Design a protein around this ligand. Structure first.
Ligand SMILES: *[C@@H]1O[C@H](CO)[C@@H](O)[C@H](O)[C@H]1NC(C)=O
Lengths: 213, 50
């Protein structure tokens, strides 16, 4: 809205990373203090610094807050293993008559080397045919990272309806697994000759096909 | 001290202006500031709008 933030910033583990926040002349440039918060994906945000002059208890001295007139800046020294969150600008807005937050910046560069995927295709069982639906699942497992595109074909034309893709989660051995469903009906399930899932990972494409008859 | 008949030019006539107009526009532009007063609600005295 009134506060704009960059989408992402790049940095190195050991150099200074500085973020710039720009607002208007009635909320941040008017004279109000600013407050910075960290939005960890899974835990409630806490206070990092208030007023850019005092250090709250339990917060390291590594964070520095300054206000260069209309714009406020935050500087850090070194990237540890907990900066995988979002930074927001919070200041009192007189026009909104309340508190307004910023956009949010993501702090990550790269942590995902390559691996070899493997897929499996399982046709629906006999009890699923009487439910007036056809759920086609092609599971993908033992792959890294979790960025796999899913395409469905029926050996004559691609299927662009009912295609879904689930987000992958970390396995026990630091890998990823995912599944892809396809909503259909048993009326046209037997008419088609075969069904298959097609995926592509870093140029490696594998295909598995099942036969209902 | 003796002037004969004829035409004679003595000085020049200059019409000096008495008023000056220096206005460049007819009106200037404005910025949104009536919302400070024309608002649905105001603030308090411990925390007022700045
Ligand atoms: C506020 O609204 C009134 C009526 O709507 C209008 O006459 C006036 O010019 C506006 N601005 C101020 C500063 O009062």
């Amino acid at each position: 809205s009134v506060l704009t933030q960059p989408p992402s910033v790049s940095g190195a583990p050991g150099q200074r990373v500085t973020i710039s926040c720009t607002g208007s002349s009635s909320n941040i440039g008017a004279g109000y203090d600013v407050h910075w918060y960290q939005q960890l994906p899974g835990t409630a945000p806490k206070l990092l610094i208030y007023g850019n002059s005092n250090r709250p208890s339990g917060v390291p001295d590594r964070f520095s807050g300054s206000k260069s007139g209309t714009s406020a800046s935050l500087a850090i020294t070194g990237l540890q293993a907990e900066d995988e969150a979002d930074y927001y600008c919070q200041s009192y807005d007189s026009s909104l008559s309340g508190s307004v937050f910023g956009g949010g910046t993501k702090l990550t560069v790269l942590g995902q080397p390559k691996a070899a995927p493997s897929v499996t295709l399982f046709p629906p069982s006999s009890e699923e045919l009487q439910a007036n639906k056809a759920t086609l699942v092609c599971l993908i497992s033992d792959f890294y990272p979790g960025a796999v595109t899913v395409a469905w074909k029926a050996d004559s034309s691609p299927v662009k309806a009912g295609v879904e893709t689930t987000t992958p989660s970390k396995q026990s051995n630091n890998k990823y697994a995912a599944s892809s469903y396809l909503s259909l009906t048993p009326e046209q399930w037997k008419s088609h000759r075969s069904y298959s899932c097609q995926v592509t990972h870093e140029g490696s494409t594998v295909e598995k096909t099942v036969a209902p008859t | 001290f003796t002037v004969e008949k004829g035409i004679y030019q003595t000085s020049n006539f200059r019409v000096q202006p008495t008023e000056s107009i220096v206005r460049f526009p007819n009106i200037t532009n404005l910025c949104p500031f009536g919302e400070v007063f024309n608002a649905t609600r105001f603030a308090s005295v411990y925390a007022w709008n700045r």
